[PDB]
PDB file of C-alpha atoms in Angstrom:
ATOM      1  CA  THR A   1       1.796 -14.585   4.878  1.00 45.20           C
ATOM      2  CA  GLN A   2       2.990 -11.025   4.856  1.00 39.67           C
ATOM      3  CA  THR A   3       0.614  -8.916   6.891  1.00 42.83           C
ATOM      4  CA  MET A   4       0.775  -5.447   8.372  1.00 44.12           C
ATOM      5  CA  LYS A   5       1.047  -5.556  12.195  1.00 42.32           C
ATOM      6  CA  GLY A   6      -0.697  -2.725  14.052  1.00 41.24           C
ATOM      7  CA  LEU A   7      -2.569  -1.490  11.013  1.00 41.55           C
ATOM      8  CA  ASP A   8      -4.603   1.580  11.795  1.00 38.03           C
ATOM      9  CA  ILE A   9      -7.001   1.313   8.869  1.00 35.86           C
ATOM     10  CA  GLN A  10      -8.083   4.921   9.565  1.00 33.93           C
ATOM     11  CA  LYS A  11      -4.630   6.212   8.513  1.00 34.40           C
ATOM     12  CA  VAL A  12      -4.944   4.670   5.021  1.00 34.32           C
ATOM     13  CA  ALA A  13      -7.707   7.210   4.287  1.00 33.93           C
ATOM     14  CA  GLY A  14      -7.510   9.222   1.064  1.00 34.10           C
ATOM     15  CA  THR A  15      -5.896   9.148  -2.316  1.00 33.68           C
ATOM     16  CA  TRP A  16      -3.833   6.294  -3.777  1.00 31.28           C
ATOM     17  CA  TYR A  17      -2.206   5.396  -7.103  1.00 33.02           C
ATOM     18  CA  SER A  18      -1.887   1.818  -8.416  1.00 32.11           C
ATOM     19  CA  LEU A  19       1.763   2.157  -9.310  1.00 28.99           C
ATOM     20  CA  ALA A  20       2.178  -1.589  -9.907  1.00 28.21           C
ATOM     21  CA  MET A  21       0.077  -4.744  -9.902  1.00 31.41           C
ATOM     22  CA  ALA A  22       0.855  -8.469 -10.113  1.00 29.28           C
ATOM     23  CA  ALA A  23      -1.124 -11.649 -10.321  1.00 29.59           C
ATOM     24  CA  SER A  24      -0.876 -15.421 -10.228  1.00 25.03           C
ATOM     25  CA  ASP A  25      -2.395 -15.748 -13.696  1.00 25.69           C
ATOM     26  CA  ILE A  26      -1.632 -13.661 -16.826  1.00 26.47           C
ATOM     27  CA  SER A  27      -5.325 -13.656 -17.844  1.00 27.50           C
ATOM     28  CA  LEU A  28      -6.339 -11.856 -14.607  1.00 25.47           C
ATOM     29  CA  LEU A  29      -4.365  -8.723 -15.655  1.00 25.32           C
ATOM     30  CA  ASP A  30      -3.415  -9.076 -19.383  1.00 25.76           C
ATOM     31  CA  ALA A  31      -5.997  -6.798 -21.105  1.00 26.29           C
ATOM     32  CA  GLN A  32      -7.567  -3.468 -20.077  1.00 28.95           C
ATOM     33  CA  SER A  33     -10.891  -5.342 -19.601  1.00 29.55           C
ATOM     34  CA  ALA A  34      -9.239  -8.174 -17.606  1.00 35.07           C
ATOM     35  CA  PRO A  35     -11.108  -8.913 -14.402  1.00 34.58           C
ATOM     36  CA  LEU A  36      -8.579  -7.872 -11.754  1.00 31.98           C
ATOM     37  CA  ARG A  37      -7.233  -4.886 -13.639  1.00 30.68           C
ATOM     38  CA  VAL A  38      -8.523  -2.253 -11.240  1.00 27.88           C
ATOM     39  CA  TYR A  39      -7.192   1.180 -10.454  1.00 27.12           C
ATOM     40  CA  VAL A  40      -7.565   2.501  -6.913  1.00 25.92           C
ATOM     41  CA  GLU A  41      -8.500   6.200  -6.502  1.00 26.07           C
ATOM     42  CA  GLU A  42      -9.469   6.555  -2.916  1.00 28.05           C
ATOM     43  CA  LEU A  43      -9.793   4.475   0.246  1.00 27.14           C
ATOM     44  CA  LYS A  44     -12.621   5.595   2.558  1.00 28.30           C
ATOM     45  CA  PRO A  45     -12.820   3.576   5.798  1.00 30.95           C
ATOM     46  CA  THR A  46     -16.089   3.740   7.759  1.00 34.58           C
ATOM     47  CA  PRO A  47     -16.166   4.468  11.574  1.00 34.49           C
ATOM     48  CA  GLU A  48     -17.361   0.838  11.908  1.00 36.23           C
ATOM     49  CA  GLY A  49     -13.828   0.019  10.635  1.00 37.55           C
ATOM     50  CA  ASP A  50     -14.903  -1.441   7.297  1.00 36.80           C
ATOM     51  CA  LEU A  51     -13.111  -0.210   4.153  1.00 38.58           C
ATOM     52  CA  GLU A  52     -14.736   1.517   1.177  1.00 40.77           C
ATOM     53  CA  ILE A  53     -12.685   1.495  -2.053  1.00 43.11           C
ATOM     54  CA  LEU A  54     -13.388   3.828  -4.953  1.00 42.13           C
ATOM     55  CA  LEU A  55     -11.768   2.321  -8.023  1.00 38.95           C
ATOM     56  CA  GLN A  56     -11.851   2.418 -11.791  1.00 40.02           C
ATOM     57  CA  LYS A  57     -12.313  -0.665 -13.935  1.00 39.97           C
ATOM     58  CA  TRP A  58     -12.349  -0.691 -17.736  1.00 37.38           C
ATOM     59  CA  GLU A  59     -15.896  -1.766 -18.558  1.00 38.03           C
ATOM     60  CA  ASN A  60     -18.383  -1.121 -21.460  1.00 37.98           C
ATOM     61  CA  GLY A  61     -15.767   0.500 -23.732  1.00 36.23           C
ATOM     62  CA  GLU A  62     -15.388   2.870 -20.783  1.00 36.73           C
ATOM     63  CA  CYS A  63     -13.359   3.416 -17.644  1.00 37.94           C
ATOM     64  CA  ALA A  64     -16.067   2.911 -15.037  1.00 38.19           C
ATOM     65  CA  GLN A  65     -16.048   4.269 -11.458  1.00 35.79           C
ATOM     66  CA  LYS A  66     -16.816   1.538  -8.967  1.00 35.87           C
ATOM     67  CA  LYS A  67     -17.473   1.591  -5.218  1.00 38.37           C
ATOM     68  CA  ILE A  68     -16.745  -1.461  -3.096  1.00 41.12           C
ATOM     69  CA  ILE A  69     -16.922  -2.334   0.618  1.00 43.64           C
ATOM     70  CA  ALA A  70     -14.291  -4.621   2.061  1.00 45.15           C
ATOM     71  CA  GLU A  71     -15.754  -5.787   5.362  1.00 42.54           C
ATOM     72  CA  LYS A  72     -13.448  -5.969   8.379  1.00 41.93           C
ATOM     73  CA  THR A  73     -12.590  -9.257  10.103  1.00 40.33           C
ATOM     74  CA  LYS A  74     -11.065 -10.242  13.439  1.00 40.51           C
ATOM     75  CA  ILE A  75      -7.679  -9.818  11.695  1.00 42.49           C
ATOM     76  CA  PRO A  76      -7.094  -6.010  11.264  1.00 41.70           C
ATOM     77  CA  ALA A  77      -5.002  -6.325   8.081  1.00 41.99           C
ATOM     78  CA  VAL A  78      -7.551  -8.694   6.430  1.00 44.46           C
ATOM     79  CA  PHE A  79     -10.837  -7.707   4.867  1.00 45.60           C
ATOM     80  CA  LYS A  80     -13.541  -9.518   2.903  1.00 44.18           C
ATOM     81  CA  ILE A  81     -14.872  -7.994  -0.266  1.00 48.37           C
ATOM     82  CA  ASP A  82     -18.332  -9.547  -0.569  1.00 49.38           C
ATOM     83  CA  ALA A  83     -18.995 -12.423  -2.930  1.00 47.36           C
ATOM     84  CA  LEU A  84     -19.620 -15.484  -0.683  1.00 48.99           C
ATOM     85  CA  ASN A  85     -17.251 -13.519   1.577  1.00 47.11           C
ATOM     86  CA  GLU A  86     -14.904 -15.465  -0.744  1.00 46.32           C
ATOM     87  CA  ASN A  87     -12.274 -12.867  -1.557  1.00 48.93           C
ATOM     88  CA  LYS A  88      -9.894 -11.669   1.146  1.00 50.64           C
ATOM     89  CA  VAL A  89      -7.962  -8.414   0.861  1.00 53.34           C
ATOM     90  CA  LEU A  90      -4.759  -8.487   2.985  1.00 53.81           C
ATOM     91  CA  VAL A  91      -2.718  -5.355   3.724  1.00 55.66           C
ATOM     92  CA  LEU A  92       0.877  -6.569   3.624  1.00 55.47           C
ATOM     93  CA  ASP A  93       2.637  -3.373   4.544  1.00 56.27           C
ATOM     94  CA  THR A  94       2.146   0.402   4.595  1.00 53.74           C
ATOM     95  CA  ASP A  95       3.770   3.550   5.996  1.00 54.97           C
ATOM     96  CA  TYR A  96       0.459   5.407   5.517  1.00 52.33           C
ATOM     97  CA  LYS A  97       2.080   8.461   3.958  1.00 54.14           C
ATOM     98  CA  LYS A  98       3.925   7.086   0.865  1.00 54.93           C
ATOM     99  CA  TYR A  99       3.141   3.437   0.028  1.00 53.53           C
ATOM    100  CA  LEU A 100       0.725   0.564   0.686  1.00 51.26           C
ATOM    101  CA  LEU A 101       1.031  -3.059  -0.466  1.00 53.21           C
ATOM    102  CA  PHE A 102      -2.049  -5.290  -0.634  1.00 52.30           C
ATOM    103  CA  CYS A 103      -3.098  -8.576  -2.207  1.00 51.13           C
ATOM    104  CA  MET A 104      -6.477 -10.037  -2.924  1.00 49.82           C
ATOM    105  CA  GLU A 105      -7.012 -13.781  -2.936  1.00 52.12           C
ATOM    106  CA  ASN A 106      -9.681 -16.280  -3.844  1.00 50.18           C
ATOM    107  CA  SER A 107     -10.618 -18.507  -0.868  1.00 48.84           C
ATOM    108  CA  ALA A 108     -11.496 -21.549  -2.961  1.00 46.33           C
ATOM    109  CA  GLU A 109      -8.190 -22.140  -4.888  1.00 48.56           C
ATOM    110  CA  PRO A 110      -5.825 -19.345  -3.592  1.00 50.30           C
ATOM    111  CA  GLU A 111      -2.825 -19.646  -5.955  1.00 47.74           C
ATOM    112  CA  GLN A 112      -5.308 -19.939  -8.885  1.00 49.33           C
ATOM    113  CA  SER A 113      -6.474 -16.308  -8.269  1.00 47.24           C
ATOM    114  CA  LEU A 114      -4.181 -13.867  -6.454  1.00 46.01           C
ATOM    115  CA  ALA A 115      -3.588 -10.238  -7.461  1.00 50.31           C
ATOM    116  CA  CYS A 116      -1.468  -7.697  -5.540  1.00 50.40           C
ATOM    117  CA  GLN A 117      -0.745  -3.987  -5.901  1.00 50.51           C
ATOM    118  CA  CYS A 118       1.795  -1.372  -4.883  1.00 47.77           C
ATOM    119  CA  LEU A 119      -0.196   1.746  -4.035  1.00 47.33           C
ATOM    120  CA  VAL A 120       1.508   5.111  -3.624  1.00 46.32           C
ATOM    121  CA  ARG A 121       0.224   8.459  -2.408  1.00 48.97           C
ATOM    122  CA  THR A 122       1.599  10.577  -5.327  1.00 48.56           C
ATOM    123  CA  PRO A 123       1.924   9.967  -9.150  1.00 48.87           C
ATOM    124  CA  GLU A 124       5.719   9.362  -8.895  1.00 45.30           C
ATOM    125  CA  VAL A 125       7.569   6.087  -9.306  1.00 44.12           C
ATOM    126  CA  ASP A 126       8.770   5.252  -5.805  1.00 40.90           C
ATOM    127  CA  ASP A 127      11.790   2.930  -6.035  1.00 43.48           C
ATOM    128  CA  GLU A 128      11.611   1.965  -2.330  1.00 41.63           C
ATOM    129  CA  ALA A 129       7.924   0.972  -2.612  1.00 44.10           C
ATOM    130  CA  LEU A 130       8.605  -1.153  -5.714  1.00 46.02           C
ATOM    131  CA  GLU A 131      11.596  -2.769  -4.009  1.00 46.29           C
ATOM    132  CA  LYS A 132       9.260  -3.586  -1.094  1.00 46.89           C
ATOM    133  CA  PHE A 133       6.652  -4.822  -3.563  1.00 50.09           C
ATOM    134  CA  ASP A 134       9.115  -7.080  -5.451  1.00 50.97           C
ATOM    135  CA  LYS A 135      10.336  -8.738  -2.175  1.00 48.64           C
ATOM    136  CA  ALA A 136       6.802  -9.316  -0.927  1.00 51.53           C
ATOM    137  CA  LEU A 137       6.353 -10.854  -4.409  1.00 55.45           C
ATOM    138  CA  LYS A 138       9.404 -13.213  -4.369  1.00 54.89           C
ATOM    139  CA  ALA A 139       7.486 -15.592  -2.091  1.00 54.90           C
ATOM    140  CA  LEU A 140       4.304 -15.734  -4.271  1.00 55.42           C
ATOM    141  CA  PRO A 141       3.313 -17.594  -7.476  1.00 53.94           C
ATOM    142  CA  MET A 142       3.168 -14.481  -9.787  1.00 57.64           C
ATOM    143  CA  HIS A 143       3.101 -14.719 -13.601  1.00 60.44           C
ATOM    144  CA  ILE A 144       2.217 -11.139 -14.600  1.00 59.11           C
ATOM    145  CA  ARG A 145       3.594  -7.845 -13.281  1.00 56.92           C
ATOM    146  CA  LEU A 146       2.566  -4.424 -14.638  1.00 53.57           C
ATOM    147  CA  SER A 147       3.790  -0.951 -13.734  1.00 53.23           C
ATOM    148  CA  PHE A 148       2.794   2.572 -14.724  1.00 56.72           C
ATOM    149  CA  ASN A 149       4.626   5.854 -15.440  1.00 58.22           C
ATOM    150  CA  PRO A 150       3.558   9.245 -13.919  1.00 61.84           C
ATOM    151  CA  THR A 151       1.563  10.311 -17.000  1.00 58.62           C
ATOM    152  CA  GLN A 152      -0.481   7.118 -17.038  1.00 60.11           C
ATOM    153  CA  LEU A 153      -1.060   7.514 -13.253  1.00 61.42           C
ATOM    154  CA  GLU A 154      -2.856  10.899 -13.913  1.00 64.38           C
ATOM    155  CA  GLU A 155      -5.241   9.353 -16.442  1.00 62.95           C
ATOM    156  CA  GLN A 156      -8.447   7.349 -15.945  1.00 66.00           C
ATOM    157  CA  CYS A 157      -7.742   3.588 -16.288  1.00 66.04           C
ATOM    158  CA  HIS A 158      -3.986   4.402 -16.590  1.00 68.24           C
ATOM    159  CA  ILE A 159      -4.605   5.102 -20.277  1.00 63.29           C
TER     160      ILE A 159
END
């Protein structure tokens, strides 16, 4: 468990770039159409305190815009993106203004499906953020890690 203490979810509002992403299984992130290959654009939290995510996911030969609600929980750094409320999104760490680390995990067999990202505010490769991402990662059963250059970060689906 790495989790962000004293997370003001309101301060994560706005634009983010999926600088890097890692997952427990290669097949979760290997191809463009892989199921956890998602690209965050914006985080819109509701006054309720729930969290709306605009993302892109490569879909029917097309980068597709998607909108998703992660529902809040008693834990402020932990949300539930609705399936059977099966998938938890945990915010591991953020400074609000440069980086944010999160992971998503399957409830049923956790290590079987776990993906995490290093989000940044700008399309620049932040060495500190990626350092922080790689040390949050040391402790986890990761088998695929991807990262993106500034050009790719300004393109839909990091293409």
